[PDB]
Paper text:
Members of the [name] family form heteromeric assemblies, which function as volume-regulated anion channels.
In contrast, the same units show increased mobility in the [name]/[name] complex as reflected in the lower local resolution of the cryo-EM density of the LRR domains and their attached sybodies, which are both weaker and less well defined than the transmembrane part. Similar to Sb1, [name], and Sb3 both target individual [name] subunits on the convex side of the LRR domain but, in contrast to former, they bind to a region that is located closer to the transmembrane domain. For complexes with [name] and Sb3, the interaction involves residues on repeats 3–6 on the LRR domain. Despite the common inhibitory phenotype of the sybodies Sb1, [name], and Sb3, the channels in their respective C3-symmetric complex structures adopt distinct conformations that can be approximated as rigid body movements of pore and LRR domains. In [name] and Sb3 complexes, these conformational changes are the consequence of the relaxation of a steric clash of the respective sybodies bound to the r-subunit with the LRR domain of the neighboring l-subunit, which would prevail in the conformation observed for the apo protein and the Sb1 complex. In the [name]/[name] complex, the conformational differences compared to the apo protein can be approximated by a small (7°) rotation of the LRR domain in the r- and a larger (17°) rotation of the LRR domain in the l-position around a hinge located at the respective connection to the pore domain. The consequent opening of a gap in the center of interacting subunits leaves only few contacts at the N- and C-terminal ends of the respective LRR domains. Due to the described movements, the three l-domains, which approach each other at the threefold axis of symmetry in the apo protein, have retracted by 16 Å to open a gap at the intracellular side. Among the five sybodies, the interaction with [name] is distinguished by the slowest dissociation rate koff (with a residence time of over 300 s in the dissociation phase).
Residue numbers in the entry:
A (entry chain F): 153 to 176, 230 to 254
B (entry chain F): 356 to 808
C (entry chain L): 1 to 120
D (entry chain F): 15 to 51
E (entry chain E): 230 to 355
Write the structure that this text describes.
């Protein structure tokens, strides 16, 4: 539960989700790297759960 | 969400993960909706595209451009997940190569490119929109596609009216069909080069009908049997007839009607006898007849009847002697006889004052006729694995000889007069290191001093 | 959008005259290089008739050469194909095929619905 | 905190009902121990 | 004149999320409903509390008389009894009645404020 709520909180406020919901330009390198890492760990957590 | 937001690629989660989503929905659906994007393949794909654009900057693609054999700017993409949008910012780009790029979409921003003329789609299914398709219909010259199935080739290939070259390297042999898929080649009436490579058994009727306005037709069956049955007579203006590895096993009778041909090659076609040269007299533009990688016992005496031979090739064959009549054609420039079971060269070869490149590698020629060296227009003379003990002393009078190789020969003496030539550098004359030391060194320093530039 | 519908296909005794028609869409019939295709049962789909834009030149396969006449009619956006004295081998399913779209927006190629014709 | 998102309305309702029942329990226990003559 | 790129991006994201939140919220109509219903509950509870408390506050007094029908155990039928907390409980009940009166007046003001403006519509004209 702690891991799931941490992942949900991280994915809730991530600006990548903001852009995805806005579309339903230029993105910082750190933001893109963080988004890719979050994608990978979300997929790994899904496989784990 | 996957039916409203068009993010339909969100698979349902299994137990112990659906329950938490239900709990979140009971608390607030917004958390679940915002977390849903990370579970969609579309979001991952567009994040990959954005990371590609951020990584593959304009300068990186600019530096990554290369020069192809055709001397034009070329860019090669290998196993990439997509085409970065910064690629289409290189207006000077002219050739684009794509290999093993999955689900590739050509954006309308390709219309930003202007110098692009050739497209290479190796094992890539290209999806193109209307404006980009119009841009390609107006500003595309050559196309290269590689495939294994029929379906993976673009279905809009026949929509490119201004295409000039086509390169098929797939397997078009479908289930008992007369090559229906390529039947759309009749749409492209502006085609110049067709490069079918699909192990043809019968020449497709579409190719027969489209060859009446075709310029350079190259077919490679990789040893697969090919039959004509009067299939080359329809064409009237073809100039290149590359039939590499088409398993002809005999010179077809349909080639005689093509008097406008200039370049002909029959490499690896399992030929036995080529005495049909008497039927090639109709070809008054035939100057580049290539017959290497074949099985010819002897050269017919009918070569002398022709006189327009400029590029002749009978390499990798087993011919015991060269008839003198073959030397009658004085306008040879690129005659090469490599890997041939030849015994000696007749002195009539000394009348070939117009010859430029001659390759006599892997030939059992005991001696070189002094008459051959009397010509001064020789440009390249390649000698590899030949029965030679000495080099004639009259080669020194040659001044236009650009290069010569003596590798594999059991020579032991290098004449001094070879060292005096206006056109002679280290790269031009490559021989054994031990044999190089027999010549006096006083000219070696002078040559090496001019070897810089 | 762009779509095509076949019409006129039906069973007919040998020796009859058939006039297959096609209903086209927003793409010009004067443009949009056009094909009349056949798929034979127990066989693979094979092209029959070809009508070109900007010149209206006719192409045919050798097996279908001589007794098939294709044309394109504008001001009604139609493609017609007349066969006289059809032989038993003509039994197939005929489609209208568009390989080049109109002047602009160059939309992808679409296969027709098709009509089955039989020769007895 | 962080787990408030993990408790639906029934969970918090049951938590408050348990709090009130605990108040009843402690009140009754204090009554009994102080005077249950 | 010139604003930082980070500031502009933050303002743009804030604009986007404000618009999205506004779109999401207008279909709820739940916070207003719950607030109105709980205020109605407060008002009716105040009414009932005031009515019953005012009716029964006079029922508490110091001296009481109990005829509990106990003869076989004590020998007397009636008893004059005194409740020491009666005056303290009476003044406590008066204080609680005054507090509930003020609470009910406040809740009545809240109801009158929520029923005379149509709070589902915001003016935003100033």
């Amino acid at each position: 539960l702690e891991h799931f709520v941490s992942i949900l909180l991280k994915c809730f406020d991530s600006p990548w989700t903001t852009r995805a919901l806005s579309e339903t330009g230029v993105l910082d390198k750190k933001e893109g790297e963080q988004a890719k890492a979050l994608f990978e760990k979300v997929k790994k957590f899904r496989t784990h759960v | 969400i996957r039916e409203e937001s068009s993010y339909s690629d969100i698979p349902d989660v299994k137990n112990d993960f659906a329950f938490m989503l239900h709990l979140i929905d009971q608390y607030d659906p917004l958390y679940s909706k915002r977390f849903a994007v990370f579970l969609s393949e579309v979001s991952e794909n567009k994040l990959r595209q954005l990371n590609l654009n951020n990584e593959w900057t304009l300068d990186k693609l600019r530096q990554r451009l290369t020069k192809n054999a055709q001397d034009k700017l070329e860019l090669h993409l290998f196993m990439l997940s997509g085409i970065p949008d910064t690629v289409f910012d290189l207006v000077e780009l002219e050739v684009l190569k794509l290999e093993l790029i999955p689900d590739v979409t050509i954006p309308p921003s390709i219309a930003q490119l202007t110098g692009l003329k050739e497209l290479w789609l190796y094992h890539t299914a290209a999806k193109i929109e209307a404006p980009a398709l119009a841009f390609l219909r107006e500003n595309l010259r050559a196309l290269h596609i590689k495939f294994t199935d029929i379906k993976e080739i673009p279905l809009w290939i026949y929509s490119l009216k201004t295409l000039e070259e086509l390169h098929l390297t797939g397997n078009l042999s479908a289930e008992n069909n007369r090559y229906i898929v390529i039947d759309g080649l009749r749409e492209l009436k502006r085609l110049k080069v067709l490069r079918l490579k699909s192990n043809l058994s019968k020449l497709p009727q579409v190719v027969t009908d489209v060859g009446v306005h075709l310029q350079k037709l190259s077919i490679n069956n990789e040893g697969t049997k090919l039959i004509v049955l009067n299939s080359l007579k329809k064409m009237v203006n073809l100039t290149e007839l590359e039939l590499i590895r088409c398993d002809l096993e005999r010179i077809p009778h349909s080639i005689f009607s093509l008097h406008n041909l200039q370049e002909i090659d029959l490499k690896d076609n399992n030929l036995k006898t080529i005495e049909e040269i008497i039927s090639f007299q109709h070809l008054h533009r035939l100057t580049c007849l290539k017959l290497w990688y074949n099985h010819i016992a002897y050269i017919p005496i009918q070569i002398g009847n022709l006189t327009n031979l400029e590029r002749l090739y009978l390499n990798r064959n087993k011919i015991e002697k060269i008839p003198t009549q073959l030397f009658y054609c004085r306008k040879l420039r690129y005659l090469d006889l490599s890997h041939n079971n030849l015994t000696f060269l007749p002195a009539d070869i000394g009348l070939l004052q117009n010859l430029q490149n001659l390759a006599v590698t892997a030939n059992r020629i005991e001696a070189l006729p002094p008459e051959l060296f009397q010509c001064r227009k020789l440009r390249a003379l390649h000698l590899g694995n030949n029965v030679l003990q000495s080099l004639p002393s009259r080669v020194g009078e040659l001044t236009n000889l650009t290069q010569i190789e003596l590798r594999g020969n059991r020579l032991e003496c290098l004449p001094v007069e070879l060292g005096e030539c206006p056109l002679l550098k280290r790269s031009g004359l490559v021989v054994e290191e031990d044999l190089f030391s027999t010549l006096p060194p006083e000219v070696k320093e002078r040559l090496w001093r001019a070897d810089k530039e | 959008q762009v779509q095509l519908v076949e019409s006129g296909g039906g069973l007919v005794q040998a020796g009859g005259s058939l006039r297959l028609s096609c209903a086209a869409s927003g793409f010009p019939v004067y443009q949009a290089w056009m094909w009349w295709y056949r798929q034979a049962p127990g066989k693979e789909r094979e092209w029959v008739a070809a009508i070109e834009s900007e010149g209206q030149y006719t192409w045919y396969a050798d097996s279908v050469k001589g007794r098939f006449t294709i044309s394109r009619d504008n001001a009604k956006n139609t493609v017609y194909l007349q066969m006289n004295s059809l032989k038993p081998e003509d039994t197939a399913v005929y489609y209208c095929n568009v390989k080049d779209t109109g002047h602009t927006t160059n939309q992808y190629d679409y296969w027709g619905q098709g009509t089955q014709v039989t020769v007895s | 905190p962080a787990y408030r998102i993990l408790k639906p309305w029934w969970d918090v309702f049951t938590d408050y009902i348990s709090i009130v029942m605990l108040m009843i329990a402690v009140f009754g226990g204090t009554l009994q121990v102080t005077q249950d003559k | 004149g010139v604003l930082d790129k980070k500031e502009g991006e933050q303002a743009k994201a804030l604009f986007e999320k404000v618009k999205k939140f506004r779109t999401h919220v207008e279909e709820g109509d739940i916070v207003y409903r719950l607030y109105m219903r709980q205020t109605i509950i407060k008002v009716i509870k105040f009414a009932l509390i005031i009515c019953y408390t005012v009716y029964y506050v006079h029922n508490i007094k110091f001296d009481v008389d109990c005829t509990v029908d106990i003869e076989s155990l004590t020998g007397y039928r009636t008893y004059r009894c005194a409740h020491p907390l009666a005056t303290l409980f009476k003044i406590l009940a008066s204080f609680y009645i005054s507090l509930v009166i003020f609470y009910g007046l406040i809740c009545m003001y809240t109801l009158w404020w929520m029923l005379r403006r149509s709070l589902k519509k915001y003016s935003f004209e100033s």
